[PDB]
Design a protein around this ligand. Structure first.
Ligand SMILES: Nc1ncnc2c1ncn2[C@@H]1O[C@H](COP(=O)(O)OP(=O)(O)O)[C@@H](O)[C@H]1O
Lengths: 169, 460, 57, 600, 18, 460
């Protein structure tokens, strides 16, 4: 019976290993579902970008939201090559709104030598004078920044709440 | 929701040891988290230790090797370190910074919790009175442990403190009068075979379904050991006070954590403490040790068992000294008892448990617990003080009763203390062995036991 | 022999209830992805410029 | 691409115009182009530690950024060689300079691009096979002992588009070419690896086999294993170097790397003289043991900053050979000199000390260096198994084992061989203490001893108990004299003295005691514990009787037997052989048994 | 003694260079 | 050659301690040599210890007493300290800085050699194996010395280490089984009695055309004790590795060298080691002791014999402790034997020579040398144990063998060690005395000597 228990030990360890692998399999499946959801969100954004009437307002928001973050005398905007006629209007519109709520002057230039990769979903990037400080107001960046904070809410809305959590504080 | 875009600075102005210094930061926030992108493309994380004007002083968790001062990009988060927390974290193995290391996905968060904690009103706590029966006589019989305590294991180098820790984890339960513990386990600077030992011991006794591991091995970065005991104590607080379970937290090598503390304090050119450790090491260990106990209205608890190794077997070193001012007792693993093939080598004379008086006695364990423990302690002390001069001056100058204390010494160290690495004794077996040992002395020599108890338990 | 016998059947039973759990996950996900996609895409497409509150005009 | 020198102090240079220079990157300082590493940055300036002498370096000298870290070359031509910390071959400097020195800033490749090696490919790989990092894709016959498996670098992958036929190639010919994602790599026999990055493995396994030294102690009482970690602390004149060199001569390892880090230069000339004469038997043919040894020497008057680069140079050569499937042992002589180099460099930087002057990160360096020893499943498709043991000597100032380096190491290593100066002054060698030493691999070797010797663990526990009781008797005899003693105590004392003087003691500079196999060890211990048992039983069974056989009776009766028990150690394992030694030890037992029947 | 002298030296370096 | 004019600066920025600081220097070179002329015309010399931009930190060998920051004029040499070296230096007396103090001219240099030397390639050495016969049985018979060894004398204050040194110098030569040394003597911080003693002893008990003295006395500059042994050793290396002679170097009171080194280290606030000595004292003593041995292809050698004085007779002090980690043995001079009027007062238990095993034996001295040595060691140790047991248990509690050991002790200390200050014992006489001492015991007590040696050498 000492050897009987010596083999009972192996049965125990094998059952433990099987249960562990099953848990990890289910966790990986849930991770796959979340990743598919995020990819579909990217597709929705890319569908939005083609609506130029709404993309213009999106760009108006993004440019000013970057300018309010840098707050430098001279700034530079980097866009896509096909987005240039729209980001030009966005900058031309956002300069006075920046001079009103800050009370100082500003010189904003659109970098026409270097463009963002043409495969990105959209957005702009803002640099300071000597290009050492940078904000990245793209759609990839914004979606990745916002989606990662809503993960408790996304989990709750997608897979139901946890019936073991008695106190939320 | 922080919805504004983040700022990325290519303005590093110094690298020195574990620290990176940046200039031209816009409104630097203190304790903020920073993401560093090295020239080749690898990514590290750091935390801001000091802001002053436009400067910021980041400590990088994964070291500063490969970092230059012209092409490394530091992106500022805008928030303090909030770790993702969930109940699926049981059964998973992480590294010292919370990343999955067992071929599993990242934690899908139930919540995001600040890893510094949240102060608990001293008026909303509960006093711990439920004894934990660990199955070890030296602890159960004489240094009882209540469920909710914080009691470390003072050990040394080459001694079996991992065996004692694992046996406690394996055998711990409540005192049987008529579920069980979840386990959180942080390892700071252990070798590979200690981690192998602990994983094998957990999964060979069917526990792994209910264990969360955070592992920082001795080949891993040193500055991670600063946040490792705080991700292990933020999970234990979610499970205990929100999911309402009873958690047991093991913190292995609380000495490596303090060495990393000293290493970061020495790179900042601060006024040193004793032995070079920072002057705020007391206030730093107290924010780790004091995350344990029960709170009102919630049916969960947290028990803490840190594990030190005293340098040179010295209990007046800063680490054991300051740890003793904060925790409720200590279990002392001795080297002299180790060298004579005794397991577990627990020396009961400098061991102590400050929550024992209120967890034992009539209606909890048995009415004779405290008196037996007191008399055994007093007898052991008197026997040591005898044995000293017996070895020094005269084996025959010993009195007639100065030989009963020596026989008690031998039988107590061989029958009460020495237990066996898989033996699970009840409390009542421990008390019966204590009485079998106390029966060596005539009942007139037991002055620390009342007459009502001697009358009921001595004559058997 | 009894161990070599049970070793496979236990594995197949665990792999059965695993697939059960995964189908439960997928039927939970199919019925809920569109509302959360709307919420996400409305959070992303709603821009509100802002200056630091510590900024002195 | 080029900075300038701005300050010089000791081994520490400070160079300006160093904007985009990374941390821990190799640079070249001065007009002699000394080698150095960057260890601090502030603005456009960088702080460099130089691995050479800085006397004569001006202000304004050039500083050349290389863009790579300190790395070694790994190919055929490493065995039988001697290098320094920078991995410069000391036998080519001695032949291209025609001098007796090492010129400052001398540049010579670590492996010769002149020798042609015999290369044969793997016979299964053809054009198209998918190969990953770690795969043995060829074999070069280096010498008669060592086969040099040619592995792919650990971070490469692809499909073979060319693999050379068998033949003679020097280490600049393309022996492999492979394509991945549309790009091509060509690989020769030599690869380059950064000495501060750990070479990857597949898995780290537990240690299950002994590392047989030639010493009776350290094999019976405190055994190391293949893949363990050991520390030998002692004062000066105790025997750390002799133990290390005997271990490197007579152990069972396949490869030996010897790092002399800040020690005598006449202790590397004793290796380069002794080893080409010692041989070992394999297939009837004898081969010298220098065909499987490599030395890395940085003596005590060489630059102090190159004591660090020495250590990392050795442990990276131990990991290159382990990856081939060998069992390597690495002797680090006085890691305390590495700690002293660290303290010196930290002092030149004006850092805050931690304990007795040492930096606060000493224990981290020590731990991450000792965490590279172990038994591993090797990266790559052919399934191998390798191992690297580390034996580190510590030199505590004053013989005090409570110094920072000894305290830091004893919390890392699993075996502790502690040497004693009291035993060294009486010429009791090896001077192990046997009362403070320990081994944490004594339970992992139970299977081996049960399956192979099966009569040894009882003997070991009995001998340990005898030696432990003798020290309780001795501190009493020291105060109350040897007259209060029972007869069993008088027997314990004499048996412990016999063990100490004729088992633990082993003069290693003799033709009979230079090496002691394990069968001889178990035989001596058997014959020495049998006498203990017989004598104790005799003194005990006739105790109350009036005949009272006591120790003096046993001693004057067997004065012919005790001399043979003491001379058991004079039996050559080579001139007598195994059978003659075993027969003599079996005959001494019968003599003992008859002599003990004679007095009853 | 050495640690305190180092702290004071760094003080009197900072205050003079700044 | 250096054909450009030298630059002279009156731009001294500040004097402090033994260090002068100069500014506006043009491309300062590290370790350069400077010649300072004081306001009253006196001349001193210094060495650059640190450079930074336009600043240089000179350390004056004679001190900074009288230097000002307006008229002291410093001239930079343009090169490191090189000493002029020749072969006429044999038979001359210089001071600790290399100037003649025997009313002769300056050295007409055969070469100019850098006094820091060059570490010898460890592959180009030859292990020393030819035994020097010093004629002292305590060294020859038990701590044998090879030609090329570095073996110091560990003494204390008031003991006769100088006469031991001079006897070794005037008696030493090879072993004759079937031409002379050139002495180089450097003294650091000696008094006039010692210099008188050595000068008188050299030119009387031998010849003075084979000695070169470098005398730095106790009323001389302290910081020039740092370059005296390096001048001595550069002369030795020229005479040995280029002119192919056998040199014997005697460096007297390395304790004064170590104390001057401590003083210069404390002057500029460097990290200390034990008892205040700099942390680089090992790496500094090793650049002096390691310039001693043989090389491949050249027929010279250098045998070093430093002389120490251990403070308070303690061998754990930093100076003897760091010296014993570098050198290949030591000869211990004892006070307890001096108080019994024993000469030479050499205690052989704390003595050692690390090159003896390869220099003795068949064809070198005699087949039995090593066994006699080991047996004398064992017997001496056991005798000293018995001598201390009898101080507790009395004269009449010893056995029949303890008295054999107490007889061996007396006869050993009076016949083997004690020699007389002009007696030259060939090594075979020493071995015969050793065997006459070993015949006190029956041949079964000699448990370190093999049987086939006792069969040939014990009965005679
Ligand atoms: N096992 C041994 N057998 C014989 N002699 C030894 C032994 N161990 C040490 N010795 C002697 O003691 C001296 C110790 O020197 P060494 O081994 O270099 O110790 P350390 O490295 O601590 O200085 C050696 O010169 C050698 O002569």
């Amino acid at each position: 019976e000492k050897k009987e228990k010596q083999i009972e030990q192996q049965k125990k360890i094998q059952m433990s290993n099987l249960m562990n692998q099953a848990r990890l399999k289910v966790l990986r499946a849930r991770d796959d579902l979340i990743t598919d959801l995020l990819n579909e969100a990217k597709q929705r954004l890319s569908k939005v970008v083609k609506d130029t009437t709404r993309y213009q307002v999106l760009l108006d928001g993004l440019v000013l939201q970057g300018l309010y973050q840098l707050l430098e005398p001279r700034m530079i905007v980097r866009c896509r090559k096909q987005d240039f006629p729209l980001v030009k209007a966005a900058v031309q519109k956002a300069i006075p709104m920046y001079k009103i709520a800050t009370k100082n002057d500003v010189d904003v230039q659109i970098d026409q030598e270097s463009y963002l990769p043409e495969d990105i979903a959209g957005g702009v990037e803002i640099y300071n004078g000597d290009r050492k400080i940078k904000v990245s107001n793209t759609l990839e960046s914004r979606l990745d920044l916002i989606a990662q904070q809503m993960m408790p809410e996304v989990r709750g809305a997608l897979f139901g709440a946890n019936a073991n959590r008695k106190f939320l504080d | 929701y922080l919805s504004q875009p983040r700022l990325t600075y290519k303005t590093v102005s110094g690298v020195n040891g574990p620290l990176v210094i940046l200039d031209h930061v816009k409104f630097p926030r203190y304790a903020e988290i920073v993401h560093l992108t090295l020239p080749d493309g690898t990514k590290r994380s750091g935390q801001v230790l000091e802001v002053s004007g436009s400067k910021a002083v980041v400590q990088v968790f994964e070291g500063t090797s490969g970092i230059d001062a012209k092409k490394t990009s530091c992106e500022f988060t805008g928030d303090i370190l909030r770790t993702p927390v969930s109940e699926d974290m049981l059964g998973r193995v992480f590294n010292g910074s919370g990343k999955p290391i067992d071929r599993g996905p990242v934690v899908l968060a139930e919540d995001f919790l600040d890893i510094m904690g949240q102060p608990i009103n001293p008026q909303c706590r509960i006093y711990p009175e439920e004894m934990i029966q660990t199955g070890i006589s030296a602890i159960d019989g004489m240094n009882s442990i209540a469920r909710g305590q914080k009691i470390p294991i003072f050990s040394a180098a080459g001694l079996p403190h991992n065996e004692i820790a694992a046996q406690i984890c394996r055998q711990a339960g409540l005192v049987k009068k008529s579920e069980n513990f979840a386990i959180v386990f942080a390892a700071m600077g252990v070798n590979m075979e200690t981690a192998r030992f602990f994983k094998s011991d957990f999964e060979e006794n069917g526990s792994m379904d209910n264990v969360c591991l955070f592992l920082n091995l001795a080949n891993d970065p040193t500055i991670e050991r600063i946040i490792t005991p705080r991700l292990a104590l933020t999970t234990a607080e979610f499970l205990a006070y929100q999911c309402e379970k009873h958690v047991l937290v093991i913190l292995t090598d609380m000495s490596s954590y303090a060495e990393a503390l000293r290493e970061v304090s020495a790179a900042r050119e601060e006024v040193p403490g004793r032995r070079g450790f920072p002057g705020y090491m007391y206030t730093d260990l107290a924010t780790i040790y004091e995350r344990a106990g029960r709170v009102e209205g919630r049916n969960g608890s947290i028990t803490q068992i840190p594990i030190l190794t005293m340098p040179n077997d010295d209990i007046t070193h800063p680490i054991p000294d300051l740890t003793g001012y904060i925790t409720e007792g200590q279990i002392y693993v001795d080297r002299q008892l180790h060298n004579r093939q005794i397991y577990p080598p627990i020396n009961v004379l400098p061991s102590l448990s400050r929550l024992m008086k209120s967890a034992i006695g009539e209606g909890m364990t048995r009415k004779d617990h405290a008196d037996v423990s007191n008399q055994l302690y007093a007898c052991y002390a008197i026997g040591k003080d005898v044995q000293a001069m017996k070895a020094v001056v005269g084996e025959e100058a010993l009195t007639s009763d100065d030989l009963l204390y020596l026989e008690f010494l031998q039988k107590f160290e061989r029958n009460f203390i020495a237990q066996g690495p898989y033996e699970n004794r009840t409390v009542f077996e421990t008390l019966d062995i204590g009485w079998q040992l106390l029966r060596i002395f005539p009942k007139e020599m037991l002055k620390r036991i009342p007459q009502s108890t001697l009358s009921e338990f001595y004559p058997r | 022999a009894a161990a070599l016998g049970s070793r496979g059947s236990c594995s197949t039973e665990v792999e059965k209830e695993t697939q059960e759990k995964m189908t439960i996950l997928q039927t939970y996900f199919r019925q809920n992805r569109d509302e959360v996609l709307d919420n996400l895409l409305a959070f992303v497409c709603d821009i509100r410029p802002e200056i630091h509150e510590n900024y002195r005009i | 691409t080029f900075g300038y020198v701005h300050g010089v102090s000791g081994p520490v240079v400070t160079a300006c115009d160093m904007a985009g220079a990374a941390m821990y990157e190799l640079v070249r300082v001065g007009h002699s182009e000394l080698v150095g590493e960057i260890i601090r940055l502030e603005g456009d300036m960088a702080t460099i530690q130089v691995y050479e002498e800085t006397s004569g370096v001006s202000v304004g000298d050039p500083v050349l950024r290389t863009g790579k870290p300190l790395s070694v070359e790994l190919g055929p031509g490493i065995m039988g060689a001697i290098f320094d910390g920078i991995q410069r071959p000391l036998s080519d400097i001695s032949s291209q300079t025609q001098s007796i020195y090492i010129p400052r800033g001398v540049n010579v490749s670590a492996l010769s691009r002149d020798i042609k090696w015999d290369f044969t490919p793997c016979k299964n790989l053809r054009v198209g096979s998918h190969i990953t990092g770690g795969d043995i894709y060829g074999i070069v016959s280096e010498n008669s002992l060592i086969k040099h498996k040619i592995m792919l670098p650990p971070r490469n992958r692809g499909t073979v588009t060319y693999i050379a036929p068998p033949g003679n190639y020097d280490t600049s010919d393309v022996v492999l070419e492979l394509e991945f994602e549309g790009v091509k790599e060509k690989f020769t026999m030599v690869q380059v690896w950064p000495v501060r990055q750990v070479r990857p493995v597949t898995e780290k396994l537990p240690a299950n086999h002994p590392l047989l030294t030639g010493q009776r102690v350290l094999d019976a009482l405190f055994p190391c294993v293949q893949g363990g970690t050991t520390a030998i602390p002692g004062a000066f004149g105790c025997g750390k170097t002799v133990i290390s060199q005997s271990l490197s001569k007579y152990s069972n390892s396949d490869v030996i790397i010897y790092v002399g880090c800040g020690e005598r230069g006449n202790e590397m000339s004793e290796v380069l003289r002794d080893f080409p004469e010692l041989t070992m038997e394999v297939d009837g043919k004898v081969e010298s043991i220098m065909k499987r040894t490599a030395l890395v020497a940085n003596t005590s008057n060489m630059p102090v900053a190159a004591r660090e680069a020495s250590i990392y140079t050795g442990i990276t050569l131990s990991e290159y050979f382990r990856d081939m499937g060998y069992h390597v042992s690495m002797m680090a002589d006085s890691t305390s000199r590495w700690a002293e180099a660290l303290r010196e460099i930290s002092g030149r930087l004006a850092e805050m000390p931690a304990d007795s002057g040492y930096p606060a990160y000493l224990g981290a360096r020590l731990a991450s260096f000792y965490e590279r020893a172990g038994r591993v499943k090797c990266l790559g498709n052919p399934e191998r198994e390798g191992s690297v043991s580390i034996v580190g000597a510590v030199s505590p100032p004053g013989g005090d084992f409570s110094d920072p380096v000894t305290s830091a190491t004893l919390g890392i290593v699993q075996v502790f061989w502690g040497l004693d100066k009291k035993l060294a002054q009486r010429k009791h060698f090896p001077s192990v203490n046997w009362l403070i030493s320990y081994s944490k691999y004594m339970r992992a070797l139970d299977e081996y001893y049960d399956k192979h010797f099966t009569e040894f663990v009882p003997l070991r526990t009995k001998a340990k108990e005898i030696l432990q009781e003798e020290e309780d008797l001795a501190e009493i005899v020291q105060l109350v004299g040897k007259a209060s003693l029972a007869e069993t105590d008088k027997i314990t004392l004499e048996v412990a003295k016999l063990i100490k003087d004729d088992f633990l003691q082993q003069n290693g500079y003799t033709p009979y005691d230079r090496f002691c196999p394990f069968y001889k060890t178990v035989g001596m211990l058997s014959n020495m514990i049998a006498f203990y048992d017989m004598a104790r039983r005799a003194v005990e069974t006739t105790a109350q009787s009036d005949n009272k056989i006591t120790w003096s009776i046993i001693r004057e009766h067997m004065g012919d037997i005790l001399y043979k028990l003491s001379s058991m150690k004079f039996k050559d394992p080579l001139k007598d052989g195994e059978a003659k030694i075993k027969s003599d030890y079996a005959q001494l037992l019968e003599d003992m048994q008859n002599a003990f029947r004679s007095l009853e | 003694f050495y640690r305190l002298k180092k702290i004071q030296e760094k003080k009197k370096i900072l205050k003079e260079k700044s």
